[PDB]
RNA sequence: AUUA
């Protein structure tokens, strides 16, 4: 047995559930590389940068990581149009290993 | 928000106010409680820590490779650590950042210790100590505003035992959350001030900043008199709320200076060493592994 | 003290 936190949150949102609040949005230049996960805020003009730990479902829910946490101690760049649910965006999307940006938001791998 | 100080990250207590001998009075800010207009979706503590860091960027902070920073009172009622996220953004990549709080929270720090700060131990010295601790019971004002103990007793001992010479501190105080011994320790640094963030100018909150620890008294400070001087300054100098400095983050990151780190015995700290410490050009401490722990009281 |  294993509690599937990811699917449970996707189902919660689908039923009109309110997105996880208190994701820490950082002040930045908005002239960054635009990469998905970085050591420092890298939001471009079309993104918002958030503290990684606050955007991790496993960190926020106090649950085991499915593996090490790749967001804790880093900054996640979220398209401004999706910045209302950073936890949901990090779960429903994947990062282009080569490029470093989100698949369907600057790259395709 | 039209005075020239509105474009600064905040306001430091002017030197003439530090040299007075005022009696302690009730703090009465003309804009008490007013809220600042922050950039869309930005939390109060991201704005506050951003302004504290922008101000620290103007001081002679020592910034060695493998810098060691500890952040007390890093948790929040939100269950996250906005201040730690800003420190992580500000500090050079590779800086060891440890944070702590009485209550559980999720952090971007390299290590997090949960428990009363009095349970935190380290056989290592630190280059920068940040405290945002505040005792909720401080709100229950039932008597004379006297020097407070609790976590302030721990912070004074932590600075005297675990702060590297050349190191700096930023310790949050308020009208009622303050300690006389902490103000006295400010006289053990090359320079000190009480800094008010422009986003929280409507609060008696200030960060007591000690810049470049000398491990010996450079000036004798009476803590009761200095807190009275601080309140007098706040009561007679209204600060307009301002978020202006939050919009220009181009020069925000703390510059890595590669400040020299040396181990020296108290008998080797001559005036030449004190001069280097006083200019942020030297850190004196061991460069051993960083080991931390939280004491656990066992009950049946 | 953890703005609004
Ligand atoms: N004795 C003590 N030991 C440890 N933490 C303490 C303490 N007394 C108060 N605190 C903590 O001080 C904090 C004040 S609120 C801190 C907010 C945080 N700096 C931020 O970035 O938003 C609370 O989390 C409280 O638990
Ligand atoms: O978590 C997303 C968010 O927009 O939710 C509402 C507030 O808590 C914001 O600070 C936070 O970034
Ligand atoms: O950015 C510099 C700012 O500070 C200056 O002292 C002026 O008061 C202000 O007009 C200016 O915009
Ligand atoms: O002489 C004191 C000066 O140096 C100190 O180190 C401070 O960093 C600076 O703000 C101050 O003006
Ligand atoms: O760690 C944060 C918690 O402790 C603080 O002292 C606050 O009083 C409380 O509101 C908060 O939930
Ligand atoms: O809300 C009062 C003031 O504070 C804000 O932080 C802004 O700097 C200013 O535009 C506003 O008028
Ligand atoms: Cl007390
Ligand atoms: Cl700097
Ligand atoms: Mn306030
Ligand atoms: Zn995580």
Residue numbers in the entry:
A (entry chain B): 4272 to 4338, 4342 to 4383
B (entry chain A): 6797 to 7096
Could you give the paper's own sentences about this structure?
Virally encoded 2′-O-methyltransferases catalyze the last step in the capping of viral RNAs, which protects the RNAs from degradation and prevents them from triggering host defenses. For coronaviruses, this last reaction is catalyzed by the 2′-O-methyltransferase (MTase), a heterodimeric complex of nsp16 with the activator nsp10. Herein, we present structures of the SARS-CoV-2 2′-O-MTase nsp16-nsp10 heterodimer in complex with substrates and products in the presence of divalent cations. Our structures reveal important information regarding interactions of nsp16 residues with the capped RNA, the influence of a coronavirus MTase-specific four-residue insert on the conformation of capped RNA, and the role of metal ions in 2′-O-methyl transfer.
In this crystal, we observed Mn2+ and products of the reaction, Cap-1-RNA and SAH, indicating that the methyl transfer occurred in the crystal. Crystal #2 contained the m7G cap, the first four ribonucleotides, and the phosphate group of A5. The best resolved and most complete electron density for capped RNA was observed in crystal #2. The position of U2 in the active site is “locked” by multiple interactions. The phosphate group of U3 interacts directly with the side-chain nitrogen of Lys6874 and forms water-mediated interactions with residues Asp6873, Lys6874, Met6840, and Asn6841. The base of U3 interacts directly with the main-chain oxygen and nitrogen atoms of Ala6832 and forms a water bridge interaction with the nitrogen of the main chain of Leu6834. The stacking interactions between bases of U3 and A4 define the position of the A4 nucleotide. The primary metal binding site is located near the HBS, with either Mg2+ or Mn2+ occupying the same site with similar interactions.
